[PDB]
Structure 1
């Protein structure tokens, strides 16, 4: 029954806080910077390294202010939290591609209304 396509999740996960690829990337980078210092400490594990090299290959923007602006210009809408991560991470070109990938956008908003948002997201990319 758990299918994110139809916007359904358990009660505990419904009250979660979404994270973007750049956000998690910078969080892990800061954690690594803090951990590497303060000698006599247990070093990072393979999980941290794989997550780092996985999120580093999808960092659409390095500036934190870019993350702040792209979340601010998005939260003003009426979309759910789930629509804040996938759409901000994939960064599709045209509205048709976004509507095809995410079935929730089908009929939820107009065409130009989503195309302008996609163009803004593309421009915000570094």
Structure 2
């Protein structure tokens, strides 16, 4: 959460719950073109098809691009962009590790940006 609890995940880039969805269905179309998949893969594919707010390679790529410009924690880069808060205060209430870091006007601006990409 606020501190990273284990020691290995830091040098491991985090994926959005829509980028996961697009590359998992890429694995799907890879599979039926040529064994059958696990319950964990299919159940995760369903779960990330529920909460997939972006549907186009350009849109996910753009959201990645903006969040790379905005200089924030790599854990928080996806924990907002696949959660999509509306108010800055809800982003602060859900994330105890982003309070005291950012000013609220540009917060609402970039939240409007990620909502604009949808």
CA distance in 2, matches of 1:120, 1:77: 12
Classify 1:111/1:102 alpha carbon distance in 2 versus 1 (closer, same or farther; 3 Å).
same
Per-residue deviation, residues 2-29 of structure 1 (Å, max 9, x unmatched) = xxx3232433211011100111101110
* Structure with a larger share of its residues in helix: 1
Q: What's the CA shift for 1:71?
A: 0.8
CA distance in 1, matches of 2:50, 2:95: 22
- Aligned length, in residue pairs: 118
Q: Structure 2: 5+ residue runs without aligned partners? A: none
RMSD: 1.1
Q: Structure 1: 5+ residue runs without aligned partners? A: none
Higher relative contact order (CA 8 A, sep 6+): 2
4+ residue runs over 4 A deviation:
none
Per-residue deviation, residues 3-61 of structure 1 (Å, max 9, x unmatched) = xx3232433211011100111101110111111122xxx11122221111111001101
CA distance in 1, matches of 2:40, 2:93: 33
What SS is found at the alignment partner of 2:72? coil
- Per the alignment, residue 82 of structure 1 pairs with 75
- For residues 15-30 of structure 1, what are the structure 2 equivalents within 5 Å? 15-30=11-26
Q: What's the CA shift for 1:80?
A: 1.4
What SS is found at the alignment partner of 1:27? helix
What SS is found at the alignment partner of 1:105? coil
TM-score by length of 2: 0.93
TM-score by length of 1: 0.88
Pick aligned residue for 1:66 from 53, 56, 59: 59
Bigger Rg, which one: 1
CA distance in 1, matches of 2:46, 2:38: 13
